[PDB]
RNA sequence: GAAAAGCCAGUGGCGCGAAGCUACCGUGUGCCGGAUUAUGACUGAACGCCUCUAAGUCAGAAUCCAAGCUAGCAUGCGAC
């Protein structure tokens, strides 16, 4: 179209190592590996000196191009921090008659949900990324789902949220489920 | 002629009748994976925040395409 643009650059910390080839960026830290492709119009992705600056750049701009770059910046920040501490999503039971019972299938990584709305069959759904579900249930509140990838950890929690909707009548009145209560957190020990 | 064994009545009529055929008037059998939609979602800009969407992306239907089933390209072909 028209107009022009220039590069926007983020300091990469020394404690995170990055290596780039093509427009695919590999971010590595002690919490694992995260690899994404930021392909877009007039947009190249390169590492302008390791431990100094991570660069996402474009040499031409229009509304479409500019929109992608801000998004790219947000996404790469999540990866840099995600390889050093990981992200944790927190989900809290609400039930009005049915105790919902959560456990982990360690082999064939999935989270199993018993007694959603009187079902005889335990319904379970996989775990996306090498995410692990840890339960600090206490009273029967918190389920804390921890992995490196912000998107995939959130997606694993999200499929549970879709499942626990009550659709015979009236989602509003029937609050049986475990619902995403987070968009999640910094870090901590325990 | 009768006996006996049969003939004719456009298949004489009647009761039964195998073999054959046939009846949700008899029986038995009739397939499950994937890709997706609707739709809810993720991460997330545009719109520092935020949003299912712009880029990328997930789950998902009596759908669709295999799987499967029927013709077998007679003017496709292989091996022998």
Which nucleotides of strand B come closer than 7 angstroms to any CB of the protein? 40-46, 49-50, 54-59
Q: How far is the CA of A115 from the C1' of B71 (A)?
A: 52
E strand or H helix at A17? strand A17-21
Task: State the Rg of chain A over Cα.
Answer: 21
DSSP bridge pairs for A46: A55
**HSE-up of residue A161 (Cα within 13 Å, Cβ side):** 15
**B46 nearest neighbour residue (CA to C1'):** A67
Strands ordered across the beta sheet of A24-29: A17-21, A24-29, A32-37
Output the CA torsion sign for A177, A106, A187, A67.
negative
Q: From the CA of A70 to the C1' of B48: give the distance in Å.
A: 9
Q: Note the CA–C1' distance, A144 to B2, in angstroms.
A: 117
Burial (CB count <10 Å: 0-12, 13-18, 19+), residue A55 = middle
Distances (CA, A) of A171 to A138, A174, A175: 27, 5, 7
Q: How far, in Å, CA of A179 to CA of A125, rounded? A: 15
Which resolution in angstroms does this entry have?
A: 5.5
Q: Strand runs (DSSP E) across A22-131, as ranges?
A: 24-29, 32-37, 43-48, 53-58, 87-94, 101-105, 110-114, 123-126
Sign of the C-alpha dihedral, residues A119, A121, A126, A130?
Answer: positive
3-state SS, residue A72: helix
Q: Where does chain A have alpha helices with state H? A: 63-82, 150-163
B59: residue with closest CA to C1': A159
CA distance A11 to A76: 11
* Residue A137 burial (CB count, 10 A): 11
Could you identify the residue whose CA is nearest to the C1' atom of nucleotide B47? A67
Rounded CA–C1' distance between A182 and B43, in angstroms = 14
C-alpha closest to that of A93 among A158, A44, A22, A164: A164
């Amino acid at each position: 179209m028209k107009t022009i643009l220039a590069s926007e650059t983020m300091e990469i910390p020394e404690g995170v190592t990055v290596q780039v080839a093509a427009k695919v960026v590999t971010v590595e830290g002690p919490r694992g590996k995260l690899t994404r492709n930021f392909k877009h119009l007039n947009l190249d992705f390169q590492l302008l000196e390791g431990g100094r600056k991570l660069q996402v750049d474009a040499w031409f701009g229009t509304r479409r191009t500019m929109a992608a770059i801000r998004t790219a910046i947000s996404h790469v920040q999540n990866l840099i921090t995600g390889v050093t501490k990981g992200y944790r999503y927190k989900m809290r039971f609400v039930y009005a008659h049915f105790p919902i019972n959560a456990s982990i299938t360690n082999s064939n990584t999935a989270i199993e949900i018993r007694n959603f709305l009187g079902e005889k069959k335990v319904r379970k759904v996989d775990m996306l990324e090498g995410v692990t579900i840890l339960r600090s249930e206490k009273v029967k509140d918190e389920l804390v789902l921890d992995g490196n990838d912000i998107e995939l950890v959130s997606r694993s929690a999200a499929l549970i949220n879709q499942k626990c909707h009550v659709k015979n009548k009236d989602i509003r009145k029937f609050l049986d489920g475990i619902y995403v209560s987070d968009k999640g957190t910094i870090t901590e020990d325990a």
